[PDB]
């Protein structure tokens, strides 16, 4: 009683799982259909 999280409680192991959104560079290209002019 002072006024954190150990790694093993009771023979078990602390699995900290982090899910995060990184930022990925992509490219939007504009190509033409060969047969039709779209």
């Amino acid at each position: 009683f002072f006024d954190l999280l150990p790694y093993d409680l009771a023979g078990n192991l602390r699995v900290l799982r982090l899910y995060w959104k990184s930022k990925r560079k992509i490219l939007k290209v504009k190509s033409y259909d060969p047969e039709t002019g779209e």
Partner: protein, 50 residues
């Protein structure tokens, strides 16, 4: 023979703790004679003051 903690040297060479003999278990007891202790659920402390 740990020469840092054993600082008394024996007259017959080496540290004086090496000449100590210990028979830890005499026979079978059907229980642990010598063991370590814990408190049930005692998580070791880790706390920051920053």
């Amino acid at each position: 023979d740990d020469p840092v903690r054993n600082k008394i040297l024996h007259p017959m060479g080496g540290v004086a703790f090496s000449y100590r003999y210990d028979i830890w278990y005499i026979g079978t007891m059907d229980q642990p004679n010598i063991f370590k202790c814990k408190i049930k659920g005692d998580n070791e402390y880790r706390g920051y003051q920053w």
